[PDB]
Amino acid sequence: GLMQFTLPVRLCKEIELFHFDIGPFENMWPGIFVYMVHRSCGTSCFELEKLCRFIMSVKKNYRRVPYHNWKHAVTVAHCMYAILQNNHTLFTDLERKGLLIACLCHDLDHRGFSNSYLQKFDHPLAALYSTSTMEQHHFSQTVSILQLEGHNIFSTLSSSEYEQVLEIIRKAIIATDLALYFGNRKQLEEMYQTGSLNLNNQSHRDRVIGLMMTACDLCSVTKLWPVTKLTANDIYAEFWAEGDEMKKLGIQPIPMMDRDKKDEVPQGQLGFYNAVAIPCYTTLTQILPPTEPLLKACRDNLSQWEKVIRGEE
Ligand SMILES: Cc1ncc(C)n2nc(CCc3nc(-c4ccccc4)cn3C)nc12
Ligand SMILES: [Mg+2]
Ligand SMILES: [Zn+2]
Question: Which residues form the PDEase domain?
Answer without folding.
Answer: 1-312
